[model samples]
Target: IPATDAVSSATAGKKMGLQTYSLGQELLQDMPNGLNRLAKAGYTDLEIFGYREDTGKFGDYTTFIASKDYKKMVDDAGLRISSSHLTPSLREYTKENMPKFDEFWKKATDIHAELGVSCMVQPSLPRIENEDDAKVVSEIFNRAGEITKKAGILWGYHNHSNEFKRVLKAGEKPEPKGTYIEELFLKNTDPDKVMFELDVYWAVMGQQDPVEWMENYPNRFKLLHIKDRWIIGDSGMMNFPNIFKKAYEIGILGYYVELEGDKKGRTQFEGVEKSAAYLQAAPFVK
Candidate 1:
């Protein structure tokens, strides 16, 4: 160990990142300036949120921010791109729309790989109502995995609390037994191909233990979205320290700090900065 006057706990020297959705308005209005804020806040990595395959648009969605354009902005802002959340329509995953599905993922890999992102994630499943739909979506993820891998990056899925909500098939009683779409996705998707980006807050809201789930399918959870009601670790609601410990044990690909709402009259930038500070100094963050 290098000689230093510091006590090390667990997460020493871990890179910190943020999801762009946290600063949607600011970035859309002025990308470079907005990204600069994140850089100034000591966040070194980023997970971009807005990028539609059909129109090749990002940020605001209507304005087409090409891959190179976004890449240049990120580089200029002095931050590395870790992952991107690209959402395609659920219809695109169906058998009849297989061509569209492949094309969408191919475009994402082409774009995100050039941006040098570690992985591209499906932000969420679109309107999945039952177990059958969930399975079909898993197949779509399986194929997308192959596409992204072929392009020199990985494919992943980001989740919300809704996945744990009881979803019933036709005429079936709404019970907890095998009714969870998240369970179906986990059991069905190929571990090698489809990785998961777990939103810690959402998992907790769904009454699930993010740490236990990490152990249950340790291999599948490659990324984590560190989220809370406000500034991460400020609410003191989630056991972020323990979660980070388990993440390192399972070998995480990347984890991005996500902020949803501004609380206690704090700006988004301030929120992100606070979260970054806590994680960087936390004893169990390693």
Candidate 2:
């Protein structure tokens, strides 16, 4: 049998969800109604992106959603927060700027906790040019994890294709060897303090195997961002069934359907609806 068939036979019922970023403008314009639509479509959890602290465009939405009353709104819609994507300034992680970071994260964590989020993930890192850059960023992640843990949530990093790219060392001119920034962060960070939310599309885009990482990392990953070639059901190269089987075997906690949206002639709503329909019957989910 094919991997898809094999996965169908191994059904175990997993949590299904979506990252709100997949909806973009629609979500920004009307979060409550958008969430209601998602809940009705069968998504039980959500991963939020684009939070800001002030009255800026994204900030207003973040502030509104982070309000104590927002929990009621989400619960009324029959959806819960799974995790949120955050991008803390790297400048704040520096020794001279630690005080500012302290203030920023404290408020950030407080908001997430109030909204009932279990995980706070830094979705991607800034460009990394070498090992030194990787080390500094890794240290910042470790510290962030430590702080977030105190607030009763897990801190994690999400990956993109750039993190997997290889680079030459400062002095050595020989062929580049070993995985680059991603490995540095994974190997150096304290596993107890940090978790990983793997974006399988980016992994595949970067020429890496998502299943291989699952096998190698074991319980380090708690969340997955699932997307297909362009649309969820139109996956051209991904074998999601096989991936789902391996993810479950390795103890992944949840799955979130994420798509860039509407680039290939489908509206965002239509894309999410199709993805939800497929996941609703996927053998991996209950």
Candidate 3:
């Protein structure tokens, strides 16, 4: 089936969303203002990036567990966080610290559960320089996936270009074998327990086609991150329209325009806003 038909048939007419990571600097300055700007730009839904309880840059599980006011702030913005991204940490799953992460995960689930959100996603993998590290990652994520599912919230993994790097296997010649990212999908995770969120930009960067993946595994994706890159003078980032057209057709439930790279000397807000506007008015979407 064509991906476009899959998406259009599934969603029908649901609106799109944005990732809070795209507006990190703005949120660092004024979160309410940042959301307001996003609202003005026609984004009605969002995904929380990093949470801050008191005054820290990153909020850990402890902070989220204790912060009721932070949850309310997002509610007041007239946007609900459909999902939130947490760091993929091995320490979080260690016997000593695993309980703490479990507590945090439960707290996050409870908060979002009450808010009527659907899932909690681990966005991007941490660097794994060797086989031991890869094995550790695989174990941590598979366990985490099981834990999150038992909590009544879906656990998902988001892949970046680095996840597609080549590494040696014990018995085979060094071939791509679809990298650690593919291994995570094929080996470590149970399809029923693990879902995926495809970031179109990084998929392209990784030389994997998002549409093909969607066709290969329908209804396995719950979220999407959208962005465009252009190779301009000195390799500038340009917003290409074709990718999104494909995304919309393939049953992407929600999408956020991500601003990555240098942004061609534009202010971060400028770059993000432009991308959002283009997506909002894109011709391919109905």
Candidate 4:
């Protein structure tokens, strides 16, 4: 199938959704009600964050969601899991940590499979000061992608501003000159096995263009994180409509509304509500 066809078949008309991180507080306090609110607000899909193996802070969210019969719960609320954001421990991907890394992802992939998620994304990377760190991280991503592919799930990475920052190569000018870390990952990772979920806000913050990325790297992006500057409808600099048009034209699959809630002095739910409203009005959203 063509990339567009693959995306359309998988999505089945579903497009706009929410990242649970947008409502993290309410979820921690009351997951059931939080899900209800999201559904009522017109969200048809959900992307979750931080699934851990332990039972403390940031731990066992996977178990908790599963214990609540997450699949049925979201189904009842008329929603589905599009993807999840998860990261391995710092030590897990290093040479000494390679064995445990394999063991860890094995268990992690099993849990995600049980949850019936379509994709598992590593949302961030450890500190990358140079080319070697980027190479190590890229290798880890390839290995993880291979493992996830075998588990019948798509695996990907999410980017922030740091990934786009340029660094000087040996004998290169001190000023920003050549390709950066994010491009390196895309160049090195297997396109068929690995994917990307582009966060538009951070892409803009990094001085990169989301639409251009979709155009340049057609099918590599399977998902997107749509966020506004201070308010969703009031995106001062970003042009979401144009971006969405390009996104659909290029076969970019599903997208989620992720609100940082740090600006405009609005409450988290308030911001999300406006964001949801804006997406619902977009012609290309569905």
Candidate 5:
């Protein structure tokens, strides 16, 4: 998926970023070469998605990048490391897991803070059985926020369609009728500690309004994930122009474009190239 003659600037637009998972296979094959290719594709900032906690590795588990060397690797490629997705999750919420979760943050923060990432995110979570489960995860998220805060960085959650599933919609009439698990997280987590990274495409998939959620809980979202099913502009489903309009007003901490392979003939590098070109031309994007 590598291409030649890119190696130009970061982004065509004022503030466009890339989610590194867009280059997953390319990266696992060759890390340094992949970063160079991504930069050449016109992305300056990166939202990393390959931090696996059990092995404590970033992109590839085999190639061990120590805390001391991580920053320089990206810097040399001419891309800025903005945020990373941490993979420590609570499969089953229990008291015995509390100490281990806390320790994960201390170590995770220690490594990420050194890289100077302004924010870090808890990317994925296990499915919840009920409203109470959301509270349990939210509490875990809050504890992580406090630790990341001490590391001088913010911590947040990234939403997928599962979060929008209505765990309890049977309250009927006078009571809360549609109680999504996502709402519980917003309602429970402390604003100072936990924020959200809105995944616009997934929110649309969940049949929830991204702008409505932003308007209702504007303060809770500190980051953005601009995505479509494949190459960003091909779908014509997501109203990026409108979404970006609100994001500007909210003053998001950061945002990145994420691609999950392509049906179009372009390679990942080419797919991101088109994605960047679209953002570069859009009047709403700055």
Candidate 6:
């Protein structure tokens, strides 16, 4: 479908969200303020990248639960938590630590549920060194998805450029036809149990087309990480305007403005403001 027709046909409203990782540099230095800045920039929804449980920045997930005050703070700022980032620990993947994963997932889901979030995502597939190694990662994702579904939250995988790299097959020579990352989903996952969150810039960097993929796999994409990039040597990464134009045509939803490059030219807010302005003015957006 064309951009205008697809957008006009939709009954539900499309929202332009934000991934907190875009301001990751500022978050590393000043987490809370960086978040507030994003909220101020007209981002109504956010994805939590990492929380400092040890430093007690968000809260001590080990002993205590996230406080209502924190949720209120976010609400007061006009931002809602739609998704979170989970980094799987090897020890935490064992039977003994099932309790820990359960506790964390429960708390995380509770927060999202209370705030009325529609979904959650595992930002990156757990690293698998080889194709055979993918089994472990796949199992982990399946278990995580099961847990998230039980909590009434949707689970998804976020892709990076490396997820498209080649991997060796068991008997035959390596095939460029499939990416280990793609296989991780195709081989060991259930469509209803899990979904996908596409980072457009990363997909472009990996020589994939976000619009084409979304068209091919319509309902599979539940969220998006909107980061713009410049193409260098046989890549499609480029300005946000061009990408957003195609994205609108594909019937993809849940847009977020993200930045993963140096901020030497302008302040972080400047980059976000520009993207937000472009999105608001885009023909597909209301």
Q: What TM-score, to 2 decimals, does candidate 6 have?
A: 0.74
Q: Per-residue lDDT tens digits of candidate 4, residues 220-265?
A: 8888888877557576778888788888787877888887756656
Candidate order by decreasing TM-score: 1, 5, 2, 4, 6, 3
What is the C-alpha local distance difference test score of each model? 0.79, 0.74, 0.60, 0.74, 0.79, 0.61
- The local lDDT score (0 to 100) that residue 213 gets in candidate 6 is 66
Model 2 earns a TM-score of 0.86
lDDT by residue for model 3 (1-286), tens? 1122234545432255776676556565777787777666556677666643223224433333223555566668766667777763334334355555555555555555654556678776756655545665565566666777775777778877777666554455553353455554545566677778877667768877767766666667666776666221122432345545655566666765566555456666766666555555556644
Q: State TM-scores per candidate.
A: 0.88, 0.86, 0.73, 0.86, 0.88, 0.74
Candidate 2's residue-wise lDDT over 108-188, tens digit each?
787788778889888867656766667666777777788889988998889988878875555655654744667777887
How do the candidates rank by lDDT, highest first?
Answer: 1, 5, 2, 4, 6, 3
lDDT for model 2, please. 0.74
CA lDDT of 126 in candidate 5? Answer: 59
Give per-residue CA lDDT, model 1, range 65-145, as digits (tens): 777777888888888887888877545456677667888888778777777888888876666777777777888888899
Give each model's clash number: 3, 3, 6, 0, 2, 0
Model 4 root mean square deviation, Cα atoms: 5.4
Q: Write the per-residue lDDT of candidate 6 for residues 1-286, one digit (tens) a residue.
A: 1122134654432355876666555554654676666655456677765543333224322323353655666676667777766654444344455566656555566555665556767765554556655655556566667777876788788888877776664564553444556655646677777778877778878888767766767677767777765111112445455555555565455766666565366566667656665555456454
Stretches of candidate 4 off by over 4 Å are 1-14, 55-63, 91-96, 169-175, 262-265
Taking all chains together, the TM-score of candidate 5 against the true structure is: 0.88
Q: Record all residue pairs in model 2 with backbone atoms less than 3 Å apart, i.e. clashing.
A: 13-285, 13-286, 14-285
